[PDB]
Design an enzyme around this catalytic site. Structure first.
Site, PDB file in Angstrom:
ATOM      1  N   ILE A  42      47.867  49.754  30.011  1.00 61.84           N
ATOM      2  CA  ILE A  42      47.088  49.215  30.912  1.00 61.84           C
ATOM      3  C   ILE A  42      46.117  49.121  31.292  1.00 61.84           C
ATOM      4  O   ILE A  42      45.420  48.095  31.622  1.00 61.84           O
ATOM      5  CB  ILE A  42      48.488  49.448  32.267  1.00 61.84           C
ATOM      6  N   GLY A  45      43.709  46.943  28.781  1.00 58.77           N
ATOM      7  CA  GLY A  45      44.500  46.022  30.162  1.00 58.77           C
ATOM      8  C   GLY A  45      43.286  45.814  31.565  1.00 58.77           C
ATOM      9  O   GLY A  45      42.802  44.380  31.455  1.00 58.77           O
ATOM     10  N   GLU A  46      43.045  46.867  32.429  1.00 54.74           N
ATOM     11  CA  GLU A  46      42.569  46.360  33.524  1.00 54.74           C
ATOM     12  C   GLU A  46      41.032  46.651  33.577  1.00 54.74           C
ATOM     13  O   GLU A  46      40.381  45.514  33.628  1.00 54.74           O
ATOM     14  CB  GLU A  46      42.934  46.830  34.567  1.00 54.74           C
ATOM     15  N   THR A  47      40.357  47.371  31.784  1.00 53.39           N
ATOM     16  CA  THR A  47      39.611  47.306  32.082  1.00 53.39           C
ATOM     17  C   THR A  47      38.824  46.153  31.308  1.00 53.39           C
ATOM     18  O   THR A  47      37.919  45.296  31.503  1.00 53.39           O
ATOM     19  CB  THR A  47      39.229  48.457  30.736  1.00 53.39           C
TER      20      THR A  47
ATOM     21  N   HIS B  73      46.059  47.626  43.948  1.00 53.80           N
ATOM     22  CA  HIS B  73      44.814  48.000  44.016  1.00 53.80           C
ATOM     23  C   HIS B  73      44.237  48.330  46.004  1.00 53.80           C
ATOM     24  O   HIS B  73      44.325  47.179  45.996  1.00 53.80           O
ATOM     25  CB  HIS B  73      43.414  48.015  43.058  1.00 53.80           C
TER      26      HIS B  73
END
Lengths: 121, 121, 121, 121
Positions: A42, A45-47, B73
């Site tokens: 995950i 992915g966020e990166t 977030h």
């Protein structure tokens, strides 16, 4: 590079609306069982969609900010490299919505994800 | 331990349906802009509800497997420790559903998550 | 048919791993504001995967059950028909994962969705 | 009105940060199988956090706009009423994050949800 460095991430390819980043499956990013930790996947992915949205906007007057992330874990990876392909779905003025597919060495889907990135001043 | 050791996670408290795990906010887990990487916070949460489900089942017979995860977030964390509190919402025979809240030093919500854990043989 | 009737849903096309279902945007499915209710769009998507998973299994022995659904609302639908295209992402033994894209008349993405369907006795 | 009217939703309670809304389980809102359709339940929840955000803002200048919704379906609803309880998790300047729990008659969790609402001019 911070986390990106910790995970030994490498950008294999970038173009507008598309980011391909990969990383080695090492003991460092495994779950204790151990196959690659779902959280590591995950984070890759966020990166990927953070980099993507940053590439699509004006860095000088704006900043991409991860807002919402979601993920399905599918197959596992215990070795080799995993590769995340982020493709943009929506390129809104305020928000971007990204599709991310993360695969192992056998081209199996490990994680499928969607991310929502707020574009802020 | 693996990622758990890489991220220097430590259990502050466990009881049936509750896990509290924390970790220091270091350069090793930051995004390059200098705040805790959203993916690292999500990894913390996945870990919390995996441990929680492991604590509720016969692990000689069953393994917990993260199936689906989502996260908002909210605030950021630059330093100190972050703490994940995972409380179970539904303890089913085949799936567990977990609520996870993650807070920084000043008790601000950094991340709120929900985790769906499959129970497998 | 029930809800599928209430919403006047209809199957444009069906094949293995693919379901295209449309419905009219009427006052019955609108939010009090001018446009199609996000929850009506999501119900269209959930129906789409449920039908698709049903088409992929032995309906005389097993049954599909929605487990998890998530959705991004991107654009609005004011009139005409909206169309959900559900394509399968992973066809597991116990779970199916579906990608759903819902569009209006003007080819705008209204909703993008991922749905997890449990397969059960 | 509109979908709210179609589903016979009744506002049972409102205060800042809290919305309780119920609706009957009729054939109109059932899946064909058929218990309460997952999508109907999700539309109820999306309605609850939309009303709650409206209650928190100056609706002469702003409107709540559903951005992201996710949901775990747990138990099924066969008859009687189902009740959505939406409590705010985070009330930001431009986005609100809501927890929604939806129960049936027998005190069973039918659906658990998180909703992300954009506050738009």
């Amino acid at each position: 590079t911070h986390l990106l460095e910790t995970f030994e991430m490498s950008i294999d390819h970038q173009e507008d609306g598309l980011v391909v980043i990969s990383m080695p499956v090492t003991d460092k990013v495994k779950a204790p069982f151990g196959y690659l930790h779902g959280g590591a996947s995950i984070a890759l992915g966020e990166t990927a969609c953070s980099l993507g949205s940053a590439n699509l906007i004006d860095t000088t007057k704006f900043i991409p900010l991860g807002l919402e992330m979601n993920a399905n874990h599918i197959h596992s990876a215990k070795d080799g490299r995993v590769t995340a392909t982020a493709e943009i779905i929506h390129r809104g003025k305020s928000t971007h919505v990204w599709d991310i597919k993360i695969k192992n060495d056998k081209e199996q889907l490990i994680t499928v994800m969607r991310g929502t990135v707020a574009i802020k001043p």
